[PDB]
What we know:
This is CRISPR-associated RAMP family protein. It comes from Desulfonema ishimotonii. This protein has helices at about 30, 35, 170-175, 240-255, 270, and strands at about 1-5, 10, 15-20, 45-55, 75-85, 90-95, 100-105, 125-140, 150-155, 165, 195-200, 205-210, 215-220, 225-230, 235, 285, 290-295. By secondary structure, it is mainly beta. It binds a RNA duplex through strand 8 and strand 10.
Amino acid sequence: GRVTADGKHIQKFSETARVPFYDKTQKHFDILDEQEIAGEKPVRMWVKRFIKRLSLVDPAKHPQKKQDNKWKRRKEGIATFIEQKNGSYYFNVVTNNGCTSFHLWHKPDNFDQEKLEGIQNGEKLDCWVRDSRYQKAFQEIPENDPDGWECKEGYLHVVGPSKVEFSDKKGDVINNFQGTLPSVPNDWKTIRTNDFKNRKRKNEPVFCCEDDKGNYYTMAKYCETFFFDLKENEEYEIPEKARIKYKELLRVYNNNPQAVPESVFQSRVARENVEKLKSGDLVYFKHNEKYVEDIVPVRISRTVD
RNA sequence: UUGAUGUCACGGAACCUUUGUUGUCUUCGACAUGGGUA
RNA sequence: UACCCAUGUCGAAGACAACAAAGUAUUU
């Protein structure tokens, strides 16, 4: 939700999507303006809810784990090979929905047509395809995925790189870093992740670093959130109780002895010493038919009595 | 800024009454933080 | 729009509440 200009109502967004900000696969911090980052100018993003995945042998007669629930909802088509790189193969696809086509890169399974050993330019194959939730957004359409993006307008909710694990002693991620750990940056906008927790699948990027008095930090947030489809006709009134609870939430955020000692790793509410609701704020809200009941600044937050 | 044959104003204690007092173990364990994957 | 958690660290309270001036016969 978004707090209205009068400061007395909160309007409802219909949707959210994740925006990668601290990974090296994009340039959002270099191309978005300050008031777009601050969440006080609306922006227009490309959004994809579902992403396609292929198999080049029928899942129903595929060995092992693909006579499986995810593949129960099959869809069929034909694919044309057009490029190969790093063992990945590039296909244009036509599904059985008349004319309905898209390009995608595929990293073959062992049973994908002899793992595509010996396939050649211009060839084509019968295929099966599924779609799975992706719910991500970008300002510019990434290369290697040029199709299926929907243009939407909304606001960016930028909290900062505040999901951090820290210790006085070296854990599993730090032990396996393979390098000299960086120093803690001074500016929260320059942080970029430098390896992964699951380095085979390359899920879950992290930023590992060390400070001058011997603490080790692992920041494990790389996405930031995009709010879109603002409903004009759906205000909810903020009662006085909701403001008191929010002020108490802010007080407990800013008076924490157990807080991470480096403020670049704190959320905007704590890092910036926020003290009130203000017009135009972006927030998560709980409501009844007419009134706001609970307000929090981040996705997993605190609940006040 | 006096008025004149008449001024005890050195003719009148800012005096009298009121408790800085009432209540409070130098004690003590679970809590911080916000995403990630499809 | 469903699923899943992850990390180990750290002192708190340092006066508060009340009162903040009020009374002080002249007569059946």
